[PDB]
């Protein structure tokens, strides 16, 4: 059975509940993400309509065999009318093709529903300037102020300025970049354009990076592994034991990796700068954790929610425990006491 903060009242209407079956009452259900625990459910044989971005749109056509005529995408920043209520997706600064969706109900509420997202000043900007919110729905991922991290550019820079130092020193290296997701994709783009080459993956991730409206695409992908020296593995290989093996295949070309894991936050953000973070080291192997993250900080989601000021906040995540539920619930209260709405 779906819950409570997966519908959207007065609507027919549920966001990211593909996994219940038919949800009674659903005339269309929205997805914000190609992620798999919101898409966890959709498949060919689906039948009612679907509303999404375009990229998401290409994804459920090529890697999940969606049929065409249930697939509806809609623009960004573009008042669209669904089932005879307005609605507007825009840019969530998550993964790519992620949406936040604006609802104008029949009674006059209007209600945020974040999707996932990574708060950004720049969404002060968008059309959520020009009217009021009544009701957020809010992924509080990080709603706690341990959780700290770096801008993605200063983690990028990181990332370029140490590749390009260990493969300037030796050319003989092989870099490697852990994925299990779309979203990321930044890290190993980056890495193989300061050193001149395309990435390697293989035919199954490439798919998938079709799908997603990159500019130049076939300019910077590839699935011939020889070529490159930048590889895509899947993240359960980014370890000494999967990556020795790995080297093993390339058939004497490299004697040392590189590797990077782009986690989310880790409890070694609490004491060290990122310009201070060191690998884990075994022989000829060396590889970093770094915290690429595409969800809001703690200061990012106080900072757009005090901006927003929403009349009630609904969190979508963490909210399985008391403990939880109510550690949020405190510092939704302290934001609105010293913000003054
Ligand atoms: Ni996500």
């Given at each position: 059975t779906c819950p409570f903060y997966k519908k959207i009242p007065g609507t027919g209407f549920t966001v990211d509940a593909f996994?219940?079956?038919?949800?009674?009452?659903?005339?269309?259900?929205?997805?914000?993400?190609f992620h798999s625990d919101h898409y966890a459910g959709l498949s060919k044989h689906f039948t009612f309509?679907?509303?999404?971005?375009?990229?998401?749109?290409?994804?459920?056509?090529?890697?999940?065999?969606?049929?065409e005529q249930y697939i509806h995408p809609l623009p960004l920043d573009t008042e669209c009318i669904v089932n005879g209520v307005k609605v507007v997706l825009l840019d969530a600064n998550h993964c790519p093709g992620a949406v936040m969706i604006l609802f104008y109900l029949p009674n006059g509420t209007v209600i945020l529903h974040t999707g996932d997202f990574r708060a950004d000043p720049s969404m002060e900007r968008s059309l959520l300037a020009d009217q009021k919110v009544h009701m957020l729905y809010l992924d509080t991922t990080y709603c706690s102020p341990e959780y700290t991290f770096p801008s993605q550019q200063e983690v990028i820079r990181f990332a370029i300025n140490t590749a390009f130092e260990a493969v300037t020193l030796n050319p003989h290296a092989l870099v490697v970049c852990g994925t299990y997701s779309i979203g990321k994709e930044k890290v190993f783009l980056a890495?193989?354009?300061?050193?001149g080459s395309k990435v390697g993956?293989?035919?199954?991730?490439?798919?998938?990076?079709?799908?997603?409206?990159?500019?130049?695409?076939?300019?910077?992908?590839?699935?011939?592994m020889c070529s490159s020296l930048v590889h895509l593995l899947p993240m359960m290989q980014i370890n000494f034991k999967g990556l020795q093996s790995h080297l093993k295949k390339c058939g004497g070309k490299y004697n040392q990796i590189l590797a990077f894991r782009p986690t989310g936050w880790t409890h070694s953000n609490k004491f060290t700068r990122i310009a201070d973070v060191i690998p884990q080291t075994k022989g000829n192997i060396s590889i970093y954790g770094i915290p690429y993250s595409e969800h809001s900080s703690y200061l990012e989601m106080k900072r757009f929610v005090?901006?927003?000021?929403?009349?009630?906040?609904?969190?979508?995540?963490?909210?399985?425990?008391?403990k939880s539920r109510s550690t949020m619930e405190k510092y939704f209260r302290e934001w609105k006491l010293e913000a003054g709405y």
């Open positions: 996994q219940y079956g038919v949800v009674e009452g659903c005339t269309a259900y929205f997805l914000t993400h309509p679907v509303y999404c971005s375009e990229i998401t749109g290409n994804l459920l056509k090529n890697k999940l065999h969606v049929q890495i193989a354009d300061v050193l993956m293989s035919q199954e991730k490439y798919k998938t990076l079709q799908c997603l409206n990159i500019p130049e695409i076939n300019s910077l992908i590839t699935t011939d005090q901006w927003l000021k929403p009349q009630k906040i609904i969190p979508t995540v963490n909210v399985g425990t008391w």
